[PDB]
Amino acid sequence: EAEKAADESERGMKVIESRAQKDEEKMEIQEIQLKEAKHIAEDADRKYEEVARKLVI
Q: What minimum distance in Å lies between the beta carbon of 43 and another protein? A: 10
17 binds another protein (CB under 8 A): no
35 binds another protein (CB under 8 A): no
CB under 5 to 8 A by kind: which of a second copy, another protein, none does 55 bind? a second copy
Distance, in Å, from the CA atom of 37 to the CA atom of 45, rounded to the nearest integer, reads 12
User: Quick one: DSSP state of residue 41?
Assistant: H
Distance, in Å, from the CA atom of 52 to the CA atom of 16, rounded to the nearest integer, reads 53
Q: Give the residues lining the site for another protein (CB under 8 A).
A: 7-8, 11-12, 15, 46-47, 50-51
